[PDB]
Amino acid sequence: GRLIYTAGGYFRQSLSYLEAYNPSDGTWLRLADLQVPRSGLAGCVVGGLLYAVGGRNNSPDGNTDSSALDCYNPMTNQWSPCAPMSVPRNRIGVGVIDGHIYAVGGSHGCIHHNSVERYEPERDEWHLVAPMLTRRIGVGVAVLNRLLYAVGGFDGTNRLNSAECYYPERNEWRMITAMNTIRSGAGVCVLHNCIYAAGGYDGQDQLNSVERYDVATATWTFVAPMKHRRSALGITVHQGRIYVLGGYDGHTFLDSVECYDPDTDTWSEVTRMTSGRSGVGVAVT
Ligand SMILES: CC(=O)N1CCC[C@H]1C(=O)N[C@@H]1COC(=O)c2ccccc2C[S@](=O)C[C@H](C(=O)N(C)C)NC1=O
Numbered sequence: 001g002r003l004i005y006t007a008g009g010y011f012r013q014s015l016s017y018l019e020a021y022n023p024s025d026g027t028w029l030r031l032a033d034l035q036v037p038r039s040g041l042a043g044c045v046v047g048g049l050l051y052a053v054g055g056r057n058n059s060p061d062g063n064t065d066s067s068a069l070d071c072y073n074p075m076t077n078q079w080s081p082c083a084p085m086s087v088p089r090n091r092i093g094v095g096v097i098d099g100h101i102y103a104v105g106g107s108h109g110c111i112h113h114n115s116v117e118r119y120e121p122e123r124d125e126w127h128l129v130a131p132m133l134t135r136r137i138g139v140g141v142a143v144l145n146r147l148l149y150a151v152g153g154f155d156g157t158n159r160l161n162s163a164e165c166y167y168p169e170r171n172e173w174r175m176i177t178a179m180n181t182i183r184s185g186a187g188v189c190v191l192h193n194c195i196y197a198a199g200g201y202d203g204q205d206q207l208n209s210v211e212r213y214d215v216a217t218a219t220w221t222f223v224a225p226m227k228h229r230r231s232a233l234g235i236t237v238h239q240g241r242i243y244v245l246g247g248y249d250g251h252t253f254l255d256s257v258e259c260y261d262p263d264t265d266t267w268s269e270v271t272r273m274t275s276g277r278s279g280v281g282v283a284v285t
């Protein structure tokens, strides 16, 4: 029984919520709140532990970008602080290779990072790796063939359709085929050896379009669009299906959870979050 965890988010301000959805019985679990509210964070799992990486705490009285790394133990229902990153990273992308967390791009105030750093849970240490070829905030990160892909985002001036690839063994980045659509704040994940980029914002509108990268043909192909246009959505893969959680559609903060079936190329609404929010960190354990 694996659960879909949603951490933080934004609605009126940055949120502390930690909730877990059970796709089998359709139930929601209210877990221990994050010690610090955060939106624009990313979640990941290493060794059955959930990690909440970066983000920003938006409050009516002030905002603070986060360099924090926090660890949640499902067995104890406890958050424990870990070593912080070298810099705050709001609107971050995260990816796991060999139980090591890569924190990719994001912003700190006026600064749009191209820097990337890697966390080692065994040492509780962050180390900078080679920076990306492009500054990317609202970046989608996917791990495919033990390579770390950084997909779309925003560079401080322009929203990107470009994508690049990190080779951990060689410690280097290379540009790959650009997507068909410019996407900042999309849901990026890997399903059946493909990278999916669902939703996002193109500089004008929130998107419902979904495209997938096939490594063999090095091409991006459009698949069935989602029912809702959404940017700042949470995304995950559970039992061979894609789940998109919340986001912003240009008018409202969505509580909608859609599920993608690759066999039928269809999306369906599976549940609703307890409240609408955007900028959540999502992971499965
Ligand atoms: C104008 C604006 O963004 N404001 C004004 C001050 C607070 C901030 C706000 O409200 N941010 C939240 C949280 O967003 C995120 O965590 C996030 C995470 C990843 C990528 C991108 C985003 C942005 S999201 O794609 C754009 C969407 C929006 O345009 N409005 C609601 C008007 N904003 C949001 O949901």
Ligand SMILES: [Cl-]
Pocket: 039, 040, 056
């Ligand atoms: Cl924000």
